[PDB]
Amino acid sequence: WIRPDAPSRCTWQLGRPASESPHHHTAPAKSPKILPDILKKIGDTPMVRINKIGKKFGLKCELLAKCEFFNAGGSVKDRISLRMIEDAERDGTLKPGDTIIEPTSGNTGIGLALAAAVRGYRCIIVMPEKMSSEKVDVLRALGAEIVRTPTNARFDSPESHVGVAWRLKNEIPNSHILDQYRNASNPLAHYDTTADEILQQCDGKLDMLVASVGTGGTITGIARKLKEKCPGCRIIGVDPEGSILAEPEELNQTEQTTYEVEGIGYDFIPTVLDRTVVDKWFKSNDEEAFTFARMLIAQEGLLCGGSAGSTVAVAVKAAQELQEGQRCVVILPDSVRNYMTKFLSDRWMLQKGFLKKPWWWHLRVQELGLSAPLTVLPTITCGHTIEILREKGFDQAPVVDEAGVILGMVTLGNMLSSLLAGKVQPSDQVGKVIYKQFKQIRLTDTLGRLSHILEMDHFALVVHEQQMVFGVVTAIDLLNFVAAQER
Amino acid sequence: WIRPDAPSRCTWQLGRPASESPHHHTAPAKSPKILPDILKKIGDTPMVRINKIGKKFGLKCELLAKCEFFNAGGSVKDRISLRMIEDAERDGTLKPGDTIIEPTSGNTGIGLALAAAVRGYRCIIVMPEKMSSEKVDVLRALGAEIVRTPTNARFDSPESHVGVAWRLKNEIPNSHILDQYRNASNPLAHYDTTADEILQQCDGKLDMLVASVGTGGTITGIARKLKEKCPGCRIIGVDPEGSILAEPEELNQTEQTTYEVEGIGYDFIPTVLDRTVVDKWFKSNDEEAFTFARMLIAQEGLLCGGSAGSTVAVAVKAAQELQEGQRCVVILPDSVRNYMTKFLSDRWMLQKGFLKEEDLTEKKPWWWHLRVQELGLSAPLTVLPTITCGHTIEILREKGFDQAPVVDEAGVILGMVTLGNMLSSLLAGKVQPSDQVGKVIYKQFKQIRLTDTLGRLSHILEMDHFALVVHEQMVFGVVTAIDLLNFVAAQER
Ligand code: HEM
Ligand code: HEM
Ligand SMILES: *Cc1c(COP(=O)(O)O)cnc(C)c1O
Ligand SMILES: *Cc1c(COP(=O)(O)O)cnc(C)c1O
Ligand code: NA
Ligand code: NA
Structure with missing residues (x-):
């Protein structure tokens, strides 16, 4: 077994030239008019000005949203799903008709299931019990097999989503765990593409980036690139109350370790997360996450998910120091489709005490x-x-x-x-x-x-x-x- | 009241120069790096090659899908919602803070509610009872008010979605029904944008276009442009059993007039539908619609809706007449989000009889x-x-x-x-x-x-x-x- 939190052996340092990278970097590839399959509709996501929410909370700066819910599978994870599979195919790791097994909070599973459906792989997803039934519905329709694990299972217990994924792999010949928690293809997708799109869309001018953190690939990939290209850009990480990703450690002092928002926070530090490139963390809670997700829908017409709300809830605090002329970018990771009977429902919000x-x-x-x-x-x-x-x-x-x-x-x-x-x-x-x-x-x-x-x-x-x-x-x-x- | 099936007074005819149009015409435009709001994320949708489904049913031609579910609101109707509002604003019809009331099967309502949320209009949607609760939940979250009408209300009865929209409007000052059934802004959005994208994307070369039909705006706008620019292209219309849109009338003979697929078919001919530009109609049913929508998800990874399935179910028959090297384009109108607890659910499918334990156990x-x-x-x-x-x-x-x-x-x-x-x-x-x-x-x-x-x-x-x-x-x-x-x-x- 290889633990998802082992210390990284990456010898990247800021100031180190790209020539020295042992990694394969995929450059933007001119898209044909007719896409050969739906997997080419991953990336080049829109950047949209936020017009009411920033002003309402007294921001003076420009606030822009990178809308990752327009990817083919409905989330930012489609980028890492595609990249992990392509690199594994190039490596010779993944051979035709093999089996992909992934522990996931849902979106990486959906991304992998979608690619698996298109490419002809068997796909098994291992997902905590708290994750939405809307995720299960889409996973089933894509032909994924689905296993569930107790939400409160410690990550190093046999019944965690990570533990169960490794135990299934051990029983299934020709199976692989691409492993989003350790695989460099995750943060490199964001380093090579998401970050370069943001720079291009902003004409290289950006004062703050706010991103919620699960595996840490998004914030890590974007930050390493921005620190190289745009060192004036402050990097703000969002971690839910109950998680231990945030620094300093005093930010993480609560008893509760469960929360309703899906896709962010963990009980371990993922190998792919480089916390040294995050300038400042904020803790978020469920109530503000869902309040802000509903606001994003109602005021901006942005049909996004829970963690998008977490992120914007932080961004209106974190960017208060910025002035007119300055710019804050937020990442909106997934779509409202995953949450139709959850925060989108007033009955649910009431039952959970969020209204x-x-x-x-x-x-x-x-x-x-x-x-x-x-x-x-x-x-x-x-x-x-x-x-x-x-x-x-x-x-x-x-x-x-x-x-x-x-x-x-x-x-x-x-x-x-x-x-x-x-x-x-x-x-x-x-x-x-x-x-x-x-x-x-x-x-x-x-x-x-x-x-x-x-x-x-x-x-x-x-x-x-x-x-x-x-x-x-x-x-x-x-x-x-x-x-x-x-x- | 203006009936939504009054004969069109449009004098377009195939062969009339574009210089004779009395309409406003837009075109596809390059978008800015940063969108000023989400309403710019409408149009320029992907054209994606279908790799498994065509082959499985013996097609020799190329089969391409125009995927309208990537629009901001999740459907093709986002194009006509925006266009109808923009034209009414430029007209002076629609003023700041006015009320928009629209009869809809749901997607035009979602489009209009999205634009209304962004631009600051009160939005009232009038929607038949059969439409999914997923549509209601999005409408609610966008701030739309929602009224419902009996699914089997005849269009000309006071309790139809169109009749109720008119009656609401009459009691609400400064309200307007943009009226997708009669408003030229509907088929024009497709003539000006959708059709031109399809041609740009195909390098001006296609042999068949298959589109399901509700208002008729999509097929009419696309077909009028294609007949002008690509006159070889066969226009195939898809109409559910129970609807009267198809010709010849003999195709419409049936016992029931209800069906589960959402967004296609009507009991009247909408003013915006030009049936003279449809070359051939095919009748579709619910079972094949949902079978094919599930297949599009499972085999192509296209997270589309029910009418997308209807369209492809017909395309694999219609396009049998094409040979290798020809090209068929299908329109995929909306997204799976609208049907999460309907056709996406095996229990719902079983309950409805669209899935039988037999091939469910094969x-x-x-x-x-x-x-x-x-x-x-x-x-x-x-x-x-x-x-x-x-x-x-x-x-x-x-x-x-x-x-x-x-x-x-x-x-x-x-x-x-x-x-x-x-x-x-x-x-x-x-x-x-x-x-x-x-x-x-x-x-x-x-x-x-x-x-x-x-x-x-x-x-x-x-x-x-x-x-x-x-x-x-x-x-x-x-x-x-x-x-x-x-x-x-x-x-x-
Ligand atoms: C000059 C640039 C870079 C150098 C010299 C470098 C160097 C390395 C080295 C030596 C390893 C260890 C290989 C092994 O243990 O088998 C590694 C692993 C890794 N690198 Fe990099 N790297 C660079 C850039 C990046 C970037 C830009 C990212 C992400 C955006 C990244 C993410 C990773 C990850 C996730 C691993 C696997 C970590 C592990 O297994 O412990 N690296 N890198
Ligand atoms: C190219 C030459 C065209 C001409 C000469 C033409 C002419 C007309 C005229 C004169 C009317 C006004 C009817 C009236 O109120 O008296 C009209 C209405 C209309 N036109 Fe066109 N048109 C052209 C192209 C198009 C195209 C390309 C479309 C759609 C793609 C279209 C759709 C309509 C619609 C929906 C109406 C409203 C019909 C009604 O209220 O009865 N037209 N057109
Ligand atoms: C993955 C995910 C995040 C966090 O992204 P990482 O790259 O894993 O840090 C946030 N929200 C949602 C909904 C996600 O699926
Ligand atoms: C509107 C709609 C159609 C039909 O398009 P028209 O342009 O109205 O003919 C098909 N499917 C869905 C889901 C729709 O909303
Ligand atoms: Na989670
Ligand atoms: Na309908």
Whole structure:
């Protein structure tokens, strides 16, 4: 076994010329008009000015986001996945149809699974239990095999994601662990490409770089290059509370060692992380990470993930010293796709304790002044439905059976349109026209609750615990109320 | 009210010089090094060669995918959202802080909500009930207000997405419906940009273009440009069963008018759709759409949506008429993000009948239907929750076990402890020998029955490390992925 935290034997030093590098460096390769496969859509990610969040928190400098979620697999890790595989192929390590096994928090796994799918490798991913089910869904669809490990397993225990990866490799002939924690291809991808894109996009002018840290390849690769090209650029590392990557060590004094944000922080120092090139660390927490991720979406239209939020949360503190004319770049590592049922969900945010209202929000449904609806039996014909709605002056009716079970809604307009198009005959029962989907809501529920319900259903049927329908309410009724009140 | 199917008053005809257009026309532009905002990340999408799928279905031509899911909002509609807003701003129609209301199947709503978030407009989306909750979650996060309409509401009834959009607008001052069904800004975005990109990318050489159809903006804009610049190019339109877009009308004969694929097909002919520039239509269905979308992911690594699947399902038939050296381009409209809990989920697919246990078990390994009991389980040592960390080390070592379920006096399973994690914890000073195991115990696990299959175990092991075998409450066994691997390897030796 080779431990993921063994001290690095890299003899790189700032001031040492590139000639002396024992490593293979891949230069930018002119992209053809037609990409031979999706793996060429990795790199050259956009750099986008942040327009509202910096100003809101009193930054004077320019704040720019390097948006790594536009890579083919949706994350920054697509760069290292591709580079680790290509170098291993060049080395003769990785032969056609071999098996790739990787311990990952998710994104390196997705990157590797995507390349494996394209290139024809068997791919086995080992991922802690805390990681999102959205990651599992994409991994499965890409044909990866998936093993999970307890989130709280110490990294050197047999059941850690690293321990289990090495134990699987030992049982599977022609398997390899490319090993993002030790493989130079990880930070070198960022040194050769990500860093050169940033310089190019900024015309070599950059005062601060803020990056969250997991393996440390991103911050290490970018920093080694920037210290060479742009030594005035301050390097700011972001580490979650619970992790021990940050220096000085006094920053890491808490009991808690778990957190909800995914992809950053560890219980060991990865070999590829060079902490000497980080000028200053900040600790982040889950609440600010998710607050800022939601802000990035809502104010900048940037559909990014949790650690992107961590990074920007730090950047608005760290770049406060910068002046107008100066420039801070942040790395946004992955996409909102990984977190659809996590921080993107208000219910989740509430459950986890991580979370303004219009004037009408706390009012109750009954204050709408509901009209008691006409109801019809499910045995009514399409023709008699038209006749009774028009005769009684209603445009719709709940269909309710003899036992009082609400079966759905019919409307005058849809019944007429269906008749006139020959979809139903006047003597048909209403089965082919009835709207079956609706949501019940109480007389005593809030209009806020109604508003939420109306994001999923057209019709809310008003009921009460104490068999009767008190009203049918749609979004137009709620608007009419709100508008009338304020006119 | 203006019906979204009124006959087009456009007098374009194939052969009329571009100098006769009365429209505003843009073109693809080089983008700046630093984007001023994310709305610049729209257009110039990749054209990617499809390497496995074409060959597998016998195609001789080159098959290329235009991947619109790389746009800022995740779809092709980001092009028309931006264009409709920019034109309405230049017009003087849309003023600072006005309200945008749009009837949408979801992607145009997302596009407009994204632009509205950036530029500061109130945005109200009106979306049929069938559209995914993933769309709702993105819309919500972008600050859009969301209203829904019955999926099988006829377009001309008051409760359709188009009818409800009109009724909302009438009650909200300073609101506008940009109206993708009638607004020239929709097909023009594709005529001016999408089509020109496709031609630049193909060096002006292609033989067939296959596109699925909803508003008709994509196919109409592309086809009008291609018919002018590449008149050999065959235009193939894809329409779901249940929709009336396709011609001849005989193709549209069907029992149902509902389907699960999102973003294509309608019960009316949108004003922006020019069907005269479509050479041939193919009817698609849900099963092939989702089969092909999953195949695009699994074989090409293209993280696309349902209608992308519809399009490729048709392309592998339509392009059979092409020979080696010809080229077919397909439009892939949106991303897998919208369908995470729909076609991406095997449970949803099974529930819907688009996946049948038969070919779900054809691809299955020999061990798949063996039972957990056939692993030959060892009775595990269990320990009480009052055991100390020190005594856990001792009893595991003494009795020869690497792990033990923690089980209270009443038989409740509290979790697992392991020798390795207990020792690492002790050596690192996280616990002391006399501590109880609360801080080291793994509380997460999944129960499985002796009579469950190894296929079921395999699924379980994609979510949990430990499966604890129980029966109707003694523990029969503890199983992990490594145990399953060892068993399969031993039987295959
Ligand atoms: C003048 C430039 C450089 C020199 C002279 C240098 C030198 C070395 C040497 C001697 C090794 C040890 C090989 C071995 O133990 O088998 C090594 C490993 C490594 N280098 Fe470099 N290196 C340079 C640049 C870089 C850069 C730019 C990066 C990353 C951005 C990097 C990352 C690594 C990593 C991750 C390893 C593996 C560490 C280990 O196994 O302990 N190096 N380097
Ligand atoms: C090249 C010569 C073209 C001419 C002479 C032409 C002409 C016209 C005219 C005169 C109208 C106004 C209808 C009215 O309100 O009276 C119109 C509307 C329109 N045009 Fe064009 N057009 C051209 C190209 C295009 C192209 C390339 C597209 C789409 C790619 C397009 C799509 C439309 C649409 C969607 C409308 C709105 C239709 C309506 O409201 O009924 N046109 N066009
Ligand atoms: C990997 C990752 C990071 C950190 O990048 P390293 O190069 O591993 O330090 C941050 N966020 C997410 C979501 C990641 O996957
Ligand atoms: C809009 C859309 C289509 C059809 O494009 P049109 O330009 O409206 O014909 C196909 N698929 C998806 C997912 C869409 O959003
Ligand atoms: Na993590
Ligand atoms: Na649809």
